[PDB]
Amino acid sequence: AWPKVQPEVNIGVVGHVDHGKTTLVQAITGIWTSKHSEELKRGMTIKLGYAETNIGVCESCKKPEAYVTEPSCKSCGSDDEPKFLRRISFIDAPGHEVLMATMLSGAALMDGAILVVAANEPFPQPQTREHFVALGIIGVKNLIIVQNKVAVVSKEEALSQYRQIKQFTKGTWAENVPIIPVSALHKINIDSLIEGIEEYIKTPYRDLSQKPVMLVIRSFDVNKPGTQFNELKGGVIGGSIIQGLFKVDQEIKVLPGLRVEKQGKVSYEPIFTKISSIRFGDEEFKEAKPGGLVAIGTYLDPSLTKADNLLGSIITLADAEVPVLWNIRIKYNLLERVVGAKEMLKVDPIRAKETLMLSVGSSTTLGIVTSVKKDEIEVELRRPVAVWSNNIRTVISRQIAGRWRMIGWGLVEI
Ligand SMILES: Nc1nc2c(ncn2[C@@H]2O[C@H](COP(=O)(O)OP(=O)(O)CP(=O)(O)O)[C@@H](O)[C@H]2O)c(=O)[nH]1
Numbered sequence: 001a002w003p004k005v006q007p008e009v010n011i012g013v014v015g016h017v018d019h020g021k022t023t024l025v026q027a028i029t030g031i032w033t034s035k036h037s038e039e040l041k042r043g044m045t046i047k048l049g050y051a052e053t054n055i056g057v058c059e060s061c062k063k064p065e066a067y068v069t070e071p072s073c074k075s076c077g078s079d080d081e082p083k084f085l086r087r088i089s090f091i092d093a094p095g096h097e098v099l100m101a102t103m104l105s106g107a108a109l110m111d112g113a114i115l116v117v118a119a120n121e122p123f124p125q126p127q128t129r130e131h132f133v134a135l136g137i138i139g140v141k142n143l144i145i146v147q148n149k150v151a152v153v154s155k156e157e158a159l160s161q162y163r164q165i166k167q168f169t170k171g172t173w174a175e176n177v178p179i180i181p182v183s184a185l186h187k188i189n190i191d192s193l194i195e196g197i198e199e200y201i202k203t204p205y206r207d208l209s210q211k212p213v214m215l216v217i218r219s220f221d222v223n224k225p226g227t228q229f230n231e232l233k234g235g236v237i238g239g240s241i242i243q244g245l246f247k248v249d250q251e252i253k254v255l256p257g258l259r260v261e262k263q264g265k266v267s268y269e270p271i272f273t274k275i276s277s278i279r280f281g282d283e284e285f286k287e288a289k290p291g292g293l294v295a296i297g298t299y300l301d302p303s304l305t306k307a308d309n310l311l312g313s314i315i316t317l318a319d320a321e322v323p324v325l326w327n328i329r330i331k332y333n334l335l336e337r338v339v340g341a342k343e344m345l346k347v348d349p350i351r352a353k354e355t356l357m358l359s360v361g362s363s364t365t366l367g368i369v370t371s372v373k374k375d376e377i378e379v380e381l382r383r384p385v386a387v388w389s390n391n392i393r394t395v396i397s398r399q400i401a402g403r404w405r406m407i408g409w410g411l412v413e414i
Pocket residue numbers: 016017018019020021022023024043044045046093094095096148149150152182183184185186
């Protein structure tokens with residue numbers, strides 16, 4: 001039988017609005033990632049979506065069909081069990097331009113990515129570009145480009161767009177990135193995509209001796225309403241471990257922590273707690289490593305974790321030394337153009353006292369520029385940010401025409 005293990009790798013799913021990211025994840029995993037009522041109602045991804053699957057291979061059968069997502073080789077005429085390869089998981093990002101920040105958050109959790117390009121829409125759409133560039137900037141470079149919805153266009157049209165994609169990636173880090181055509185909705189050529197995932201998105205090496213750091217994207221109260229107080233379960237915090245590993249019963253802290261109000265005056269203080277449980281999907285474990293989205297059960301009052309209250313926090317061991325900063329210095333570079341805009345726009349240089357949006361790990365924070373130089377800016381933040389290492393990538397956004405747009409990136413210097 002196949003072992004029950006945590007996912008060992010995170011694959012982002014990005015691309016322009018309605019190009020079929022969520023349906024693609026469903027075609028691969030059998031799971032629809034949209035869990036929130038507002039998402040199902042409006043017909044869009046809003047929060048980061050998540051889904052897991054095992055990946056195996058039928059060793060006597062021919063590829064790519066030999067690749068499977070369940071322990072069966074019957075589809076190639078074998079009664080033998082397929083060889084288990086690994087468990088993988090998907091970080092399903094929203095495509096809407098207004099939700100770019102959320103994509104950025106998700107990108108901090110990705111080991112690799114699939115860029116979904118609809119074959120029946122003109123390439124390259126604004127968020128195709130913005131997500132692509134974001135991936136490059138952040139360093140998520142194990143990329144597969146998927147042409148989705150090919151079953152509604154002729155082979156000729158698909159090939160025309162394929163040529164466009166090669167032209168686009170030529171001269172960039174993605175020049176030799178593979179392009180794989182599928183229909184997510186009708187489940188066509190999915191096997192080729194699985195094969196591509198095995199070939200192009202290897203599980204990266206993990207140095208488990210590093211200090212444990214988890215980036216937080218979820219937090220919730222798992223109690224049913226009208227639950228008896230003496231049966232109230234502790235708050236749960238969800239996210240991905242980007243380095244090291246966590247274990248049940250470890251003393252941990254959430255940084256920057258909780259918002260404290262003292263007569264209108266606002267500060268943040270670390271939340272200290274203890275790991276009471278560890279879960280990936282429907283399975284419980286004793287330890288949690290990079291790869292997958294983990295649910296950390298704690299002894300926290302559920303009111304503290306309710307409704308993603310802790311989104312953008314990090315979790316570390318209680319004794320870790322981590323700067324929590326209300327001002328940061330960033331060694332930066334700007335893009336030439338606002339790639340996410342419908343109409344072409346040049347990026348203006350950073351101006352003093354300008355308000356910018358900074359993406360750091362899973363966090364998104366507004367700040368005011370207090371110093372501008374050619375290679376460096378300094379920023380006074382509205383809320384503090386936890387900086388767990390030197391030279392963490394940040395992505396810089398500017399409000400253009402009422403919309404926050406990515407305009408550059410940098411390294412947080414401590
Ligand atoms: N014809 C066809 N339609 C598809 C395919 N994949 C998705 N769609 C359609 O596109 C629409 C949006 O699909 P969805 O998977 O939600 O796209 P999405 O990119 O996740 C939307 P968002 O950007 O808000 O997260 C749906 O009507 C869906 O049926 C496909 O392979 N072929």
